[PDB]
Write a protein that binds this ligand. Structure first.
Ligand SMILES: CC(=O)N[C@H]1[C@H]([C@H](O)[C@H](O)CO)O[C@@](O)(C(=O)O)C[C@@H]1O
Ligand SMILES: *[C@@H]1O[C@H](CO)[C@@H](O)[C@H](O)[C@H]1NC(C)=O
Ligand SMILES: *[C@@H]1O[C@H](CO)[C@@H](O)[C@H](O)[C@H]1NC(C)=O
Lengths: 319, 172
């Protein structure tokens, strides 16, 4: 008795190294990379709705700065905000800048509803050379710069808007800060000025701040922007004796807010992907990625490792 | 691996085995041959494809989160935002590292296991007609032509046909 039968397994000339609990370099026949380390050099405009701010960041977009008209009526899953965005209007700050930016981006649309505000005897539609629109002096087109009457008068303002719609309203308003006491009286008249905006369960009061600031677009004055949300069944009251940068209406807020914002200089292309990093879209089925912690959409999970290989075959023992 | 077949009493793998993961290599009076075993091969592949699919299985579908990059330091709130994200990343990086190490350990044991199951299957078919040579091979103590070999491979080998011949050859 002399025939032989042998049981065995395959092998290849050169396999792939993987890690186990006990060994950090085990050669197996095949393996699969689980970390995506390669990104597209562009953002995919599908299936997610991307809106390119271009030269306007989202705050200037809400305010209606010059050059931001293309953002009117816009709706987005992801607002694409550009690093090389430019201020093209009156110098301003927003006391809770990131919170306003967050609310606007999350909300996911710029749907402005014009409203008329019977302001007393004050002059309206103040403009500035810092906010040029085709070299004609202009201003934020969502705001209304209120100044004193011709007959040397700024009366107490006392206006009310009632919300009986079926959506919450976002009112953006501001307070102007003059550079000198002469400036304050030359615009306002009153000194000090002051703004008070209130709802049933909330309020806000601002004292203007007079002082010389660095020149920005030929101005020493500043505007500070604020906002007020008005729920259905609520209402809003504007009270001023000066320095109010009034709203021309309100933004519509979605009941459900599901959108966001991504700050990146990456161009929008023609590809298809549901995962965007600040370095570009990902196109992958891998469970992890090492490209950026900044990622939005249906994405692999961000990890520190550059590579993690899953064995998809047995130990490779050639010959 | 746990069973000590692959990279164990099986000295090495077969580069010539290109249509299967496991198989049979034989020698008898009319020649030699290598043939893949489908059942063992499919068992291993199914288990590995199972792992692959459970990995692809789930969702990290996120939109509005927190800021993660900052120009200048701000203090308390920024510190917390950075610590939250750094904490998350370390925990997910740990999960990824452990998952692949656990899965790979298991994959290697599963493939070692399926090799051993195949060897054990054939051992049991042969009963008293063959002896384990120790290298994953059986010495068969009777004439076994190509049809006999194929009957072993396809699981229809009837040991009683050859038993008298085999017992006589093994002993005495
Ligand atoms: C309401 C109004 O008319 N604004 C005037 C402003 C403001 O008084 C200051 O900018 C406030 O600091 O000053 C200008 O020189 C400007 O910026 O173009 C002229 C402009 O007409
Ligand atoms: C004006 O003020 C009075 C009292 O100061 C108040 O009763 C009234 O509701 C106000 N009107 C508006 C339109 O806000
Ligand atoms: C991601 O991993 C690759 C290697 O796979 C590496 O070249 C790249 O630098 C990594 N990216 C990081 C660490 O941001």
């Amino acid at each position: 008795g002399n025939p032989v039968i042998c049981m065995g397994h395959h092998a290849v000339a050169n396999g792939t190294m993987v890690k186990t609990l006990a060994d950090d370099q085990v050669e197996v026949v095949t393996a699969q990379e689980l970390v995506e380390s390669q990104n597209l050099p562009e953002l995919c405009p599908s299936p997610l709705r991307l809106v390119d701010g271009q030269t306007c960041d989202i705050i200037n977009g809400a305010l209606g700065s010059p050059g931001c008209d293309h953002l009117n009526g816009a709706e987005w899953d992801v607002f694409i905000e550009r690093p090389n965005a430019v201020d093209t209007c009156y110098p301003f700050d927003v006391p809770e800048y990131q919170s306003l930016r967050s609310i606007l981006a999350n909300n996911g649309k710029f749907e402005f509803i014009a409203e008329e505000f019977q302001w007393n005897t004050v002059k309206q539609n103040g403009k500035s050379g810092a906010c040029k629109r085709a070299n004609v002096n202009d201003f934020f087109n969502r705001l209304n710069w209120l100044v004193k009457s011709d007959g040397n008068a700024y009366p107490l303002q006392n206006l009310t808007k009632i919300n009986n719609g079926d959506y919450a309203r976002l009112y953006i308003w501001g307070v102007h800060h003059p550079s000198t006491d002469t400036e304050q009286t030359n615009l306002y008249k009153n000194n000090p000025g002051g703004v008070t905006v209130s709802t049933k369960t909330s309020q806000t009061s601002v004292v203007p701040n007079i002082g010389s600031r660095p020149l920005v677009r030929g101005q020493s004055g500043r505007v500070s922007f604020y906002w007020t949300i008005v729920e259905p069944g609520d209402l809003i009251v504007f009270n001023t004796i000066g320095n109010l940068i009034a709203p021309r209406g309100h933004y519509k807020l979605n009941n459900q807010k599901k959108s966001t914002i991504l700050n990146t200089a990456i161009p929008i292309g023609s590809c298809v992907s549901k995962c965007h990093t600040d370095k570009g879209s990902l196109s992958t089925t891998k469970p992890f990625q090492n490209i950026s912690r900044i990622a939005v959409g249906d994405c692999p999970r961000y990890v520190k490792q550059g590579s993690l290989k899953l064995a998809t075959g047995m130990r490779n023992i050639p010959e | 691996g746990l069973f000590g077949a692959i990279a164990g009493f099986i000295e090495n793998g077969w580069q010539g085995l290109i249509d299967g993961w496991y198989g049979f290599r034989h020698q008898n009076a009319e020649g030699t041959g290598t043939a893949a075993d489908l059942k063992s091969t499919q068992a291993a592949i199914d288990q590995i494809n199972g792992k692959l699919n459970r990995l692809i299985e789930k969702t990290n579908d996120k939109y509005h989160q927190i800021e993660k990059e900052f120009e200048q330091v701000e203090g308390r709130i920024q510190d917390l935002e950075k610590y939250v994200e750094d904490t998350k990343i370390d925990l997910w990086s740990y999960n990824a590292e452990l998952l692949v190490a656990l899965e790979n350990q298991h994959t290697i044991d599963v493939t070692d296991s399926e090799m051993n199951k195949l060897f054990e299957r054939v051992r049991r078919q042969l009963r008293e007609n063959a002896e384990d040579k120790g290298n994953g091979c059986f010495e068969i103590f009777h004439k076994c032509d190509n049809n006999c070999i194929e009957s072993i491979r396809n699981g229809t080998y009837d040991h009683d046909i050859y038993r008298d011949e085999a017992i006589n050859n093994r002993f005495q």
